[PDB]
RNA sequence: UGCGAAAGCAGUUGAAGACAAGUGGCUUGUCGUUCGUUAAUGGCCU
């Protein structure tokens, strides 16, 4: 009865290609400016910008139509690419979508009520692995294709011609070049510029594509003055830039933060000069006035030119990596920001904003994982540092060779994220780097985002040496499985180059929320509990036995556990009683367990479970002696004590499992874990790994790299579902790609996640006036 | 600090300028009026320009380039051409 | 019939515009809630009625955009440093300007405003202009659709108010100025198609305190045209 | 986008404007207006003395009585007033005009020691001299009352009614003995008596079920539907004198009942939880005649406190044209009878200061001035340096300056590491300086006059802090 | 008062054709009822409609406008098709067709036959000793062109071809304004400024009934087979009376009532009703031009009856972008602790002593660096 | 860079190609180069 349906979205997928791009935005509008067509990994995404909502998906499973295009296994790099109007092929003659994504694969997609599941799955003839981008006019559609050094691929224009044989689009074959290190296109598209490295020195072109209007090119050690002659590569690199729509204006936004603009006739040099970090994101308006600049600071700024002043914008949370304006007349900006808070995954953050306020309308996120490491060509943005955000210019080649060949010659990937779902409405919590994501999966979507901390995560855009003020980083928060408290504990520190700058040092508190509100009120806070200095890493809530999820007792890696309970007479949190022994020897690898009528409390240390009881928190020594063992010892270091119901019990180590039964005190059964699983975890992450059922167990899920024929780019989720303490293998589902956690919804289902971010589940006449006067209607 | 352009007949403002962000003292050009050079007590000589075709068309001035290479103040510049000095 | 009769006011009537083609007046005054009416010979109701807090508007009026006509944007604003525009749809939408990008000190008051539009003249975008009033010679001219500052023009002397004169250059073509004012009474009549520069300038003979311009005849604010060629 | 972050006995000591005004004698007891207590009356010796709750002194003032008086009592409307003396001639006359004499009757010729109205009836006046026998005179024919309620051991003293039931009468006489008549009865047995020990100072009902009595060093609790006591109270120096009840005020504790027990603190217990105090403030002395104001006394109410040397303490809380006009008349209205209602206001916040704008804008050189002068609170300066060490960077925020500037973090880091939690964070914060400015007291060799002070302040500190953690080692001993 | 000037449904009551005044000119617009916005404009205020009747059968209205013109409007093609002029420049009254032959009757108190399969006049004709008249009914005997019935201030009978008066009926006091034949021998009269509907037959002429309502009628529908007569009043309630044709032996009196109200304490008053079988359709000015409307289901509603309608009243208007307070929902929330109780997890000397190893490093770090 | 713990424990620290500069040639420093080792007065509004 159970069977894999992955359902949920994942990441908006931008043009994820290092300098091979000048725009990496293709969320379109449609010609009347009222829904937003927006790729993602998973769906494409419609919506209604008066009311932020989606009308219509086209989900990326739902047709074997589109999806084999992507669904492979290893080649899930089909990424989308651009997205035009009208339907190509008849000229222009009503209104569904066309649809390219990274391989050249010309879609024609539905737009409005209910599909035709007849897609024009058209393809033009050379578009074998390739596709920068189209650019589009009237009439004349211009493909920018790659071809292969020094690490520079080689850019073509080439014309779809398509005039009376209906079935064959041909190229025409306008242009060549074989150098290219940045490159931007108009916001019209009817003008691009690139860069060739062709040495007496590097050198800029601007070419037009659809006449023989403009095409020119100049070396750049002419914009690069003395200053820039003689300073250091920070300010001699081109960061990001942008051409207007006219043909007269080009700005080059530095490295360093400066904005050069240069005009195409007499070559002046322009130079504006707020930003104090690298620059990302550089647009003209449409009548060429405005510059709409945003880079690692916070805010959107964008200047007069005719003032060379400027307009702000001043908490984005996050950082600005494309903008531009889009409106026809051009009252939209669409934008996308990143917040790098996590250096883990590209989180990015796709967005708009009216130009009227600067309010912004549909935020489109995707889920923001909280892994442990980069994930698969996990690049990091060009700033003057190699950060603990980002690497520097100069380690482009170094950082994406120390991450490619860590994945191949490492052995330690887990990146096991830890989440939350919430007892009132079912979504789940993606606990931030001091904040939070509550993901409503049911339609894919967020509904706040809460900052966790007093840090400096808000109020101050990160700069070039704040960037190693990390903000202090939670570990997880307990729910109140009544759906009442946040209680959340979390690490921080400080920066480096201080005596106090040593110890990492722990806080934990308390939200409470009604089920009108969003967010969460404080309602208490306790530093470091257990005295100062000791981590609180294992906390557990408890069931509706006591006081309806008031228990919570924290615990350590040394060994202490304290006992929380909520009151109202003192109309706060605090303890109820107290244990700390106090080994000179630590050990962070420790599970807990609990009953779920109230009876036992399960210490699972470094290779030992120790019991004691609820009552007297103490190891219960009663006045028989007869099998009352309250002290069991494991076969070595374990991760995982769970409890599925009172009665019997898994326990999991590096090496094996292991069934326990306690009323019957014994042990059960037991199966191989170190056959799955070489050295890919951490101590401790078996915990966040599995979760039981309240019934059924628990699914164990298979820990797999698939080999080079080290491991390729290729993985794995071939998981089998257990049922009632280690007894059958009931279900091996089979999939190729990788997995971080699965949890148990109420429904008796199992969630997993996937790291391409995609979330599923295993689970159980007078009718022809009528119509006449509706088409007069408009 | 407001460098204001004013055009000479109709008597009227033409552009104005308050990047300058002290009292502005003096102020020089070229011969033909491609540039114009201020500074004042911000110790700040900056540039603004009118040397493009769209610049000499509609009469526009932008603000070019600003440096800052002094200690206190500025209290006179002045500016000279040749074709064997500039 | 009395055209408040239906729904009255209660403050005075500091603004009254028609809308360009649609049989609609518009009433705004100081209790800051602007009214709308059907108005006819017999019997004349009130469609709707924004009301709208703290912000007690003085002047307000319809605007259609030349090109697609299908706009219907209010905008309305008062003594404060805020102005609001809608686009009316028959629950509102409205929006609140108040990003002043180039001149920000200039404004203790957005209360005097018109709206123009005008050509690209190197395309054909056909767009809204606000203008509104400063203080001491300061006319800035906006976007009506995004809200950029385009630009402002300063005259010589207090401004006491202004209008907006266009003109037709070809089948399709066409040239807006604004006219300004002083309380002496020279007035500055520049173009602003392009740069917002003075091309004509005289005197009024006499006025010690002038104190309202109107243009008229063709078209103006209150007689808007409605295809480019119709100006 | 976004905005920007930021970063019960209250109530019965918000009681101020605590004036005294010292009598001649002492003050036996006092009253209260009881339909609007804005007035109120002491029982001076010979003379009563009535004043309002806004000049907080005499308003008016009756003086010829020719002996010391006892009690001073308002009828339930409100319009006159009793006395009794220690001649025993009690006298009635109308409140709000002191000169006039309604009717002076003699009661038995023991001291009329008190007299007080019916709660509710306006014709019925109960009177106790030193007879051992009460009266329940009748104000319409004061030549005999209706009832000669004896039945008494010894010097019926305290009298009261039970305020919903008509016919009980609970006297207090210096026996214990609280016994509480019948009217319909025949005066000479109560239906039961409450056991007190001593002597009852003043009996008062609190309920219509639950009356408190006091007499002693404790006082007691008694239920009169089940002749039973669930409550004493007895920490006090001596007796508790008076007695005060009030129902339905503005605080955190609903209703309240006060204690005053010659030994300067009043006592504010509380039937909601059983009578515990929220906090009792002192007097100058031997507190006999403590109440605050009823209920109605609508915001402005006064607590008084005649002591037995005679001072009162009065503590008081207390919460262009028209053409132009026509031009601006449309400023109230707000949208009532028409359509659709706009809001979109930003709100005028908490006033921020200058030290948090220069953590806003970066302004740290400014920000450290503004938090080391005198004129900003000690624990602002705290926090500012707490969390501006967790916001940014110390060396940047110290790149360029000297030791006069350094001086005031010094002077009060002086002071601040004798702090509990921000002790060793200052401690860090002259870490750093010293840390990276050693070349400048090698250069200005003044500021180690400061160093060696603190030197010496922090060697007396580091001993405290030692000796302190082995007390509480041996608390950890002898555990 | 009523913005619309006239209005009228089309046969089987799903469209509604009606005139209102915009700045000083008419203009006609159609509206289904279950937007539509092709407002056939007027030219001048000098031509107003009069009176309007649809055809069934491509589908158009017919207007008799105040000068001597019926415009054959079509309705998809939004224009008049044809004009069927006059010779006289007089004000029509009323228009009603049968088939392919319609009959106009002017103030010069002619008779006009059209036909509007081929677009002629065919006669022409006044008579004697009918002066003021308003309007007619052609009487429906299956292909009964003759005997058509005419009404003003007394109401009289015509034969064609005769062309004589045959039959005269006590009218009203008033001029009529609603004449309705609803079975093949009775006849609706109503009066304007008058209470009192009357049937009458149309051999005997002796009135069966006088319908009394509570206000001044302005329109009415019938069932096709006279079985439930609803009527609109002038104040803008409705009387719907069931059977009015069987026996209040003489005066039948209101039946069942509707208003509509809103849950404001508002009556909007409704106006122009339609009934077929167990169905009926009200119509009322939502906002100060717009017709809506609403399909009641007639036989089981009570006998008083108020419709509750939605109307903007107060509502607060809300973005599709802003919390209560007025924040970007497109963003995070912001961090705050409010007033929490702050407390270390201990519960002084110990919290004293936890950092005094932390204090003796500071303090021996102070010491070593005063040294240094 | 690896393990591990808020801890110590082991190593990279290469080469080629091309360019820049000082002196055809040599000498000093780099690389939005293939390969290997786990190793710029420019700062946040209404």
């Given at each position: 009865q159970y069977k894999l349906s992955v359902v949920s979205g994942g990441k908006p997928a931008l043009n994820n290609l290092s300098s091979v791009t000048g725009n990496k935005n293709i969320a379109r509008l449609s010609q009347d400016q009222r829904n937003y067509i927006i790729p993602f990994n998973n769906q494409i995404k419609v919506y209604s910008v008066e009311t932020r909502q989606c009308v219509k998906t086209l989900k990326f499973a739902n047709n074997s139509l589109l999806s084999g295009?992507?669904?492979?296994?290893?080649?899930?790099?089909?990424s989308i690419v651009k997205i035009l109007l009208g339907d190509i092929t008849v000229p222009q003659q009503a209104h569904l979508i066309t649809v390219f994504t990274n391989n050249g694969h010309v879609i024609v997609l539905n737009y409005k009520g209910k599909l035709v599941e007849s897609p024009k799955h058209f393809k033009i003839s050379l578009a074998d692995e390739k596709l920068a981008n189209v650019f589009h006019s009237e009439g004349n559609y211009r493909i920018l294709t790659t071809f292969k050094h020094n690490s520079l691929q080689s850019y073509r224009l080439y014309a779809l011609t398509f005039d009376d044989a209906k079935k064959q689009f041909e190229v025409a074959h306008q242009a060549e070049w074989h150098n290219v290190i940045l490159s931007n296109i108009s916001s019209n598209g009817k003008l691009l510029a690139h860069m060739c490295k062709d040495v007496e020195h590097k050198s800029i072109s601007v070419v037009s594509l659809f006449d023989d209007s403009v095409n020119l090119s100049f070396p750049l050690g002419s914009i690069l003055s003395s200053q820039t002659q003689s300073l250091s590569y920070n300010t001699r690199y081109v960061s990001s830039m942008a051409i207007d729509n006219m043909g007269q204006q080009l700005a080059v936004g530095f490295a360093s933060g400066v904005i050069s603009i240069v005009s195409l006739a007499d070559l002046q040099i322009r130079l504006l000069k707020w930003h104090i970090d690298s620059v990302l994101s550089l647009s003209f308006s449409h009548d060429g006035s405005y510059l709409l600049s945003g880079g690692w600071e916070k805010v959107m700024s964008l200047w007069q030119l005719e003032t060379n002043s400027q307009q702000f914008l001043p908490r984005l949370n996050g950082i600005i990596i494309d903008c531009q304006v889009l409106g026809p007349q051009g009252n939209y900006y669409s934008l996308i920001l990143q917040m790098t808070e996590n250096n883990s995954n590209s989180d990015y953050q796709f967005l708009l904003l009216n130009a009227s306020d600067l309010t912004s309308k549909l935020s489109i996120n995707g889920p923001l994982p909280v892994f442990n490491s980069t994930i698969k060509h996990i690049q990091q943005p060009i700033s003057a540092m190699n950060t603990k955000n980002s690497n520097s210019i100069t380690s482009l080649n170094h950082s994406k060779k120390k991450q490619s060949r860590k994945l191949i010659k490492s052995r330690r990937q887990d990146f096991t994220t830890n989440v939350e779902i919430n007892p009132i409405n079912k979504n789940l919590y993606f606990?931030?780097?001091?904040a939070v994501q509550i993901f409503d999966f049911y339609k894919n979507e967020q509904v706040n985002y809460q900052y966790?901390?007093?840090?400096?995560?808000?109020?101050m855009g990160k700069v070039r040496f704040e960037l190693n003020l990390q903000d202090p980083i939670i570990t997880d928060l307990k729910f109140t499985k009544d759906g009442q408290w946040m209680i959340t504990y979390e690490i921080e520190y400080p920066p480096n180059d201080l005596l106090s700058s040593k110890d990492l040092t722990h806080i934990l508190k308390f939200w409470t929320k009604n089920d009108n509100e969003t967010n969460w009120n404080l309602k208490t806070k306790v530093i470091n509990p257990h005295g100062i200095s000791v981590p609180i890493t294992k906390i557990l809530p408890s069931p509706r036995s006591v006081n309806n999820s008031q228990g919570c007792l924290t615990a350590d890696n040394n060994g202490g556990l304290k006992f929380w309970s909520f009151d109202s007479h003192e109309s706060n949190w605090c303890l109820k009683k107290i244990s700390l022994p106090n080994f000179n020897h630590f050990s962070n690898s420790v599970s807990l367990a609990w009953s779920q009528d109230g009876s036992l409390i399960f210490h699972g240390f470094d290779d030992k479970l120790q019991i004691l009881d609820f009552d007297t928190f103490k190891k219960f020594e009663s006045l028989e002696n007869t099998k009352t063992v309250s002290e069991f010892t494991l076969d070595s270091e374990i991760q995982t004590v769970k409890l599925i119901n009172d009665t019997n019990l898994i326990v999991a180590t590096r090496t094996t499992l292991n069934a326990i039964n306690l009323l019957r005190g014994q042990v059960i059964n037991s199966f191989d874990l170190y056959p799955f699983v070489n050295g890919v975890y951490k101590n401790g992450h078996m915990d966040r790994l599995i979760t039981c059922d309240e019934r059924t167990g628990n699914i164990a899920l298979v820990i797999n790299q698939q080999l080079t024929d080290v491991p390729t780019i290729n993985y794995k989720s071939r998981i089998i579902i257990f049922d009632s303490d280690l007894s059958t293998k009931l279900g091996n589902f089979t999939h190729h790609e990788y997995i971080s956690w699965i949890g148990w919804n109420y429904d008796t289902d199992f969630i997993f996640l996937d790291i391409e971010s995609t979330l599923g589940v295993v689970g159980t006449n007078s009718d022809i006036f009528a119509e006449q006067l509706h088409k007069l209607s408009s | 600090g407001s460098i204001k352009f004013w055009d000479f007949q109709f008597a009227t403002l033409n552009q104005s300028f308050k990047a300058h962000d002290a009292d502005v003292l003096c102020l020089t050009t070229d011969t033909d009026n491609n540039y114009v050079f201020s500074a004042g007590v911000d110790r700040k000589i900056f540039q603004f320009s009118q040397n493009t075709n769209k610049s000499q068309k509609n009469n526009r001035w932008v603000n070019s380039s600003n440096r800052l290479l002094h200690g206190n103040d500025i209290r006179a510049i002045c500016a000279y051409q040749s074709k064997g000095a500039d | 019939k009395d055209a408040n009769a239906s729904h009255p006011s209660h403050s005075a009537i500091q603004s009254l515009s028609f809308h360009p083609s649609k049989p609609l007046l518009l009433t705004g005054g100081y209790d800051k809630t602007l009214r709308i009416y059907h108005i006819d010979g017999k019997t004349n109701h009130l469609v709707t009625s924004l009301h709208l807090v703290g912000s007690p508007i003085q002047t307000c009026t319809f605007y259609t955009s030349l090109s697609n006509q299908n706009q219907q944007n209010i905008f309305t604003a008062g003594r404060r440093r805020y102005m609001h525009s809608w686009d009316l749809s028959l629950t509102a939408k409205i929006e609140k300007f108040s990003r002043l990008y180039g001149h920000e000190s200039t404004q203790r008051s957005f209360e005097n405003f018109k709206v123009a539009h005008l050509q690209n003249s190197q395309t054909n975008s056909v767009h809204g202009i606000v203008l509104l009033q400063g203080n001491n010679g300061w006319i800035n001219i906006l976007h009506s659709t995004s809200g950029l500052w385009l630009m402002g023009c300063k005259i010589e002397g207090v401004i006491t108010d202004f209008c907006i004169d266009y003109q037709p250059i070809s089948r399709g073509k066409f040239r807006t100025i604004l006219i300004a004012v002083n309380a002496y009474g020279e007035v500055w009549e520049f173009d602003l198609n392009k740069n917002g520069h003075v091309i004509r300038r005289w005197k009024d003979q006499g006025g010690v305190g002038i104190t309202k311009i109107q243009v008229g005849g063709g078209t103006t604010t209150t007689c808007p045209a409605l295809q480019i060629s119709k100006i | 986008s976004t905005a920007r972050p930021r970063i019960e006995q209250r109530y019965w000591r918000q009681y101020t404007s605590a004036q005294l005004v010292k009598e001649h004698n002492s003050v036996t007891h006092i009253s209260f207006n009881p339909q609007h207590p804005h007035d109120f009356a002491v029982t001076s010796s010979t003379r009563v003395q009535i004043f309002s709750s806004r000049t907080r002194q005499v308003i008016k003032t009756f003086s010829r009585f020719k002996d010391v008086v006892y009690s001073a009592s308002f009828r339930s409307d409100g319009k006159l007033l009793c006395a009794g003396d220690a001649t025993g001639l009690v006298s009635v006359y109308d409140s709000?005009?002191?000169?006039?004499?309604l009717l002076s009757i003699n009661a038995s010729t023991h001291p009329t020691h008190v007299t007080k109205f019916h709660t509710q009836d306006n014709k019925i006046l109960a009177t106790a001299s030193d007879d051992r026998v009460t009266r329940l005179w009748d104000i319409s024919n004061a030549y005999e009352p209706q009832l000669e309620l004896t039945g008494a051991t010894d010097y019926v003293r305290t009298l009261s009614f039970i305020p919903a039931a008509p016919h009980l009468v609970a006297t207090g006489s210096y026996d214990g003995l609280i016994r509480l008549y019948d009217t319909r009865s025949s005066g000479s047995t109560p239906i039961y008596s409450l056991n007190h020990d001593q002597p009852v100072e003043n009996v008062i009902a609190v309920s219509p079920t639950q009356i408190v009595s006091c007499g002693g060093n404790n006082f007691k609790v008694w239920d009169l539907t089940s002749n039973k006591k669930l409550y004493e109270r007895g920490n006090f120096n001596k007796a508790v004198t008076c007695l005060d009840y009030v129902e339905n005020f503005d605080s955190p504790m609903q209703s309240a009942l006060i204690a005053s027990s010659l030994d300067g603190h009043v006592k504010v217990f509380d039937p909601l939880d059983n009578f515990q105090v929220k906090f009792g403030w002192k007097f100058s002395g031997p507190v006999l005649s403590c109440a605050v104001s009823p209920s109605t006394a609508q915001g402005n109410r006064h607590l008084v406190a005649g002591l037995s040397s005679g001072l009162l303490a009065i503590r008081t809380k207390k919460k262009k044209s028209n053409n132009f006009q026509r031009m601006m008349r449309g400023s109230e209205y707000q949208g009532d009878q028409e359509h659709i209602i706009h809001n979109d206001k930003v709100r005028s916040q908490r006033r921020m200061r200058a030290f948090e704008r220069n953590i806003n804008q970066f302004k740290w050189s400014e920000a450290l001035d503004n938090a080391f002068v005198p004129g900003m609170a000690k624990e602002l300066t705290l926090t500012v340096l707490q969390e501006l060490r967790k916001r940014g960077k110390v060396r940047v925020a110290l790149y360029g300056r000297d030791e006069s500037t350094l001086e005031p973090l010094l002077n009060w880091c002086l002071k601040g590491i004798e702090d509990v939690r921000s002790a060793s964070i200052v401690a860090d914060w002259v870490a750093v300086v010293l840390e990276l400015y050693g070349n400048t007291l090698e250069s200005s060799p003044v500021l180690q006059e400061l160093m060696i002070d603190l030197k010496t302040k922090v060697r007396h500190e580091i001993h405290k802090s030692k000796e302190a953690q082995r007390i509480e080692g041996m608390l950890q001993l002898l555990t | 008062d009523s913005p619309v000037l006239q209005s009228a449904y089309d046969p089987s009551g799903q469209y509604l054709c009606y005139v209102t005044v915009a700045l000083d000119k008419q203009r006609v617009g159609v509206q289904p009822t279950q937007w539509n916005e092709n407002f056939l404009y007027l030219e001048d205020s000098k031509l107003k409609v009069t009176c309007l009747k649809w055809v069934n059968d491509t589908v158009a209205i017919i207007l008799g406008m105040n000068n001597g013109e019926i415009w054959l409007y079509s309705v998809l093609a939004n224009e008049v098709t044809y004009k069927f002029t006059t010779g006289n420049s007089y004000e029509i009254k009323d228009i009603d067709l049968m088939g392919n032959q319609l009959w106009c009757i002017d103030s010069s108190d002619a008779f006009y036959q059209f036909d509007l399969l081929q677009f002629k006049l065919l006669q022409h004709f006044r008579i004697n000793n009918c002066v003021q008249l308003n309007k007619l009914t052609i009487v429906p005997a299956g292909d009964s062109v003759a005997q058509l019935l005419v009404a003003s201030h007394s109401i009289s009978l015509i034969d064609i071809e005769e062309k004589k008066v045959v039959m005269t009926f006590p009218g009203h006091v008033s001029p009529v304004s609603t004449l309705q034949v609803i079975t093949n021998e009775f006849f609706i009269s109503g009066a304007e400024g008058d209470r009192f509907l009357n049937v009458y037959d149309i051999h005997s002429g002796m009135t069966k009934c006088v319908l009394v309502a509570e206000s001044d009628i302005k329109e009415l529908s019938h069932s096709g087979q006279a079985d439930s007569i609803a009527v609109t009043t002038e104040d803008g309630s409705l009387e719907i009376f069931v059977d009015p044709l069987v026996s209040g032996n003489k005066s039948k009196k209101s039946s069942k009532k509707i208003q509509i109200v809103s849950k404001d304490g508002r009556k909007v008053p409704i106006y122009n009703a339609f009934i077929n079988k167990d169905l009926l359709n009200v119509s009322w000015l939502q906002n100060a031009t717009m017709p809506y409307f609403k399909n009641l289901q007639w036989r089981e509603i009570p006998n008083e009856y108020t419709v509750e309608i939605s109307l903007n009243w107060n509502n607060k208007n809300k973005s599709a972008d802003r919390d209560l307070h007025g924040k970007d929902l497109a963003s995070a929330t912001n961090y705050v602790e409010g007033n929490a109780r702050v407390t270390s997890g201990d519960n002084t000397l110990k919290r004293r002593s936890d950092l005094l190893p932390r204090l003796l490093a500071l303090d021996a770090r102070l010491d070593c660096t005063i040294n240094k």
């Open positions: 295009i992507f669904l492979q296994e290893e080649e899930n790099n089909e606990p931030h780097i001091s966790l901390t007093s840090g400096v995560n808000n109020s | - | - | 709000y005009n002191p000169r006039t004499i | -």
